Design an enzyme around this catalytic site. Sequence first.
Site, PDB file in Angstrom:
ATOM      1  N   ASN A  34     -33.748 -95.552 -41.771  1.00  0.00           N
ATOM      2  CA  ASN A  34     -32.344 -95.770 -42.088  1.00  0.00           C
ATOM      3  C   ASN A  34     -31.946 -94.776 -43.170  1.00  0.00           C
ATOM      4  O   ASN A  34     -32.720 -94.493 -44.087  1.00  0.00           O
ATOM      5  CB  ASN A  34     -32.130 -97.236 -42.537  1.00  0.00           C
ATOM      6  CG  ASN A  34     -30.659 -97.625 -42.699  1.00  0.00           C
ATOM      7  OD1 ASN A  34     -30.298 -98.243 -43.698  1.00  0.00           O
ATOM      8  ND2 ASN A  34     -29.813 -97.280 -41.723  1.00  0.00           N
ATOM      9  N   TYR A  68     -17.189 -96.216 -45.406  1.00  0.00           N
ATOM     10  CA  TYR A  68     -18.292 -97.097 -45.760  1.00  0.00           C
ATOM     11  C   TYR A  68     -18.312 -97.307 -47.267  1.00  0.00           C
ATOM     12  O   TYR A  68     -18.072 -96.367 -48.034  1.00  0.00           O
ATOM     13  CB  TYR A  68     -19.616 -96.474 -45.300  1.00  0.00           C
ATOM     14  CG  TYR A  68     -20.840 -97.229 -45.733  1.00  0.00           C
ATOM     15  CD1 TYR A  68     -21.259 -98.364 -45.051  1.00  0.00           C
ATOM     16  CD2 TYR A  68     -21.574 -96.806 -46.835  1.00  0.00           C
ATOM     17  CE1 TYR A  68     -22.391 -99.061 -45.440  1.00  0.00           C
ATOM     18  CE2 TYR A  68     -22.718 -97.495 -47.249  1.00  0.00           C
ATOM     19  CZ  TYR A  68     -23.126 -98.612 -46.546  1.00  0.00           C
ATOM     20  OH  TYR A  68     -24.251 -99.311 -46.955  1.00  0.00           O
ATOM     21  N   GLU A  77     -20.773-105.331 -48.064  1.00  0.00           N
ATOM     22  CA  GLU A  77     -20.902-104.016 -47.450  1.00  0.00           C
ATOM     23  C   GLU A  77     -19.847-103.914 -46.358  1.00  0.00           C
ATOM     24  O   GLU A  77     -19.777-104.788 -45.496  1.00  0.00           O
ATOM     25  CB  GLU A  77     -22.312-103.851 -46.869  1.00  0.00           C
ATOM     26  CG  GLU A  77     -22.616-102.492 -46.218  1.00  0.00           C
ATOM     27  CD  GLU A  77     -23.992-102.464 -45.548  1.00  0.00           C
ATOM     28  OE1 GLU A  77     -24.345-103.454 -44.875  1.00  0.00           O
ATOM     29  OE2 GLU A  77     -24.729-101.452 -45.679  1.00  0.00           O
ATOM     30  N   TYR A  79     -17.418-101.477 -43.462  1.00  0.00           N
ATOM     31  CA  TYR A  79     -17.413-100.345 -42.548  1.00  0.00           C
ATOM     32  C   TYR A  79     -16.073-100.274 -41.843  1.00  0.00           C
ATOM     33  O   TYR A  79     -15.573-101.299 -41.370  1.00  0.00           O
ATOM     34  CB  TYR A  79     -18.429-100.501 -41.416  1.00  0.00           C
ATOM     35  CG  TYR A  79     -19.887-100.417 -41.738  1.00  0.00           C
ATOM     36  CD1 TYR A  79     -20.575-101.507 -42.255  1.00  0.00           C
ATOM     37  CD2 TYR A  79     -20.596 -99.264 -41.432  1.00  0.00           C
ATOM     38  CE1 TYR A  79     -21.957-101.435 -42.494  1.00  0.00           C
ATOM     39  CE2 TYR A  79     -21.962 -99.179 -41.669  1.00  0.00           C
ATOM     40  CZ  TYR A  79     -22.624-100.261 -42.190  1.00  0.00           C
ATOM     41  OH  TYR A  79     -23.976-100.137 -42.404  1.00  0.00           O
ATOM     42  N   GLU A 170     -24.603 -92.524 -40.836  1.00  0.00           N
ATOM     43  CA  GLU A 170     -25.700 -93.479 -40.961  1.00  0.00           C
ATOM     44  C   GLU A 170     -26.520 -93.433 -39.684  1.00  0.00           C
ATOM     45  O   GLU A 170     -25.960 -93.466 -38.589  1.00  0.00           O
ATOM     46  CB  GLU A 170     -25.199 -94.910 -41.202  1.00  0.00           C
ATOM     47  CG  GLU A 170     -26.350 -95.933 -41.231  1.00  0.00           C
ATOM     48  CD  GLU A 170     -25.947 -97.338 -41.703  1.00  0.00           C
ATOM     49  OE1 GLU A 170     -24.790 -97.552 -42.130  1.00  0.00           O
ATOM     50  OE2 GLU A 170     -26.831 -98.219 -41.737  1.00  0.00           O
TER      51      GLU A 170
HETATM   52  O1  LIG Z   1     -26.447 -97.443 -51.427  1.00  0.00           O
HETATM   53  C1  LIG Z   1     -27.562 -97.671 -50.525  1.00  0.00           C
HETATM   54  C2  LIG Z   1     -27.070 -98.309 -49.274  1.00  0.00           C
HETATM   55  O2  LIG Z   1     -26.210 -97.413 -48.564  1.00  0.00           O
HETATM   56  C3  LIG Z   1     -28.221 -98.658 -48.341  1.00  0.00           C
HETATM   57  O3  LIG Z   1     -27.692 -99.299 -47.272  1.00  0.00           O
HETATM   58  O4  LIG Z   1     -29.235 -99.542 -49.007  1.00  0.00           O
HETATM   59  C4  LIG Z   1     -29.714 -98.947 -50.278  1.00  0.00           C
HETATM   60  C5  LIG Z   1     -28.560 -98.560 -51.210  1.00  0.00           C
HETATM   61  O5  LIG Z   1     -29.076 -97.919 -52.387  1.00  0.00           O
END
Ligand SMILES: O[C@@H]1[C@@H](O)[C@H](O)OC[C@H]1O
Length: 183
Positions: A34, A68, A77, A79, A170
């Site tokens: 990832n 994002y 989080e 998106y 991503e």
């Molecule tokens: O900012 C980062 C984030 O994008 C990721 O998904 O997980 C770790 C984090 O540090």
Amino acid sequence: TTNYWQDWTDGVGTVNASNLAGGQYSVSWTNCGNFVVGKGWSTGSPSRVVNYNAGAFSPNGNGYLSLYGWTRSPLIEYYVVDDWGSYRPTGTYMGTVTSDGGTYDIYTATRVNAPSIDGTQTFTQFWSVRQSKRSIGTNNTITFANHVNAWKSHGMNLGSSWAYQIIATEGYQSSGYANVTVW
Ligand SMILES: O[C@@H]1[C@@H](O)[C@H](O)OC[C@H]1O
């Protein structure tokens, strides 16, 4: 203009990210785990109008191109997904929002003891996912306030403390190449 550069990877596989001039970046990856790479602002705003042009976005397998970012209090989080590769992300359906020429499905999800800006945490995702892939190589606007306000109507209220906000490439267990300019 952008003020922030993000180059995060979990270190699995090879992710080569370049902090180019201005709002431009590129990333090439091979058999990644990832990663989240992109440019934008170190403090997000619910009223920012974001523009970008993806000179290339060619995932071989799973990758996203999204607005994002993160809030804290509570930890969210979020998106706005304009493009993807082999896998269209989804969650629990809330409704739709029409913005900048596209229609987006709205989803929520819970991530239980999962990686976050604050380490392992339980947090929520807010998604707008375009119903079809947006054109690549064109000047594309995301009027983020439309998404924020659509989310609000479904009880999807963002946290009070804003962290970074980027146009992010991503990848997940994939390979690919991307080159994006943000402003
Ligand atoms: O900012 C980062 C984030 O994008 C990721 O998904 O997980 C770790 C984090 O540090």
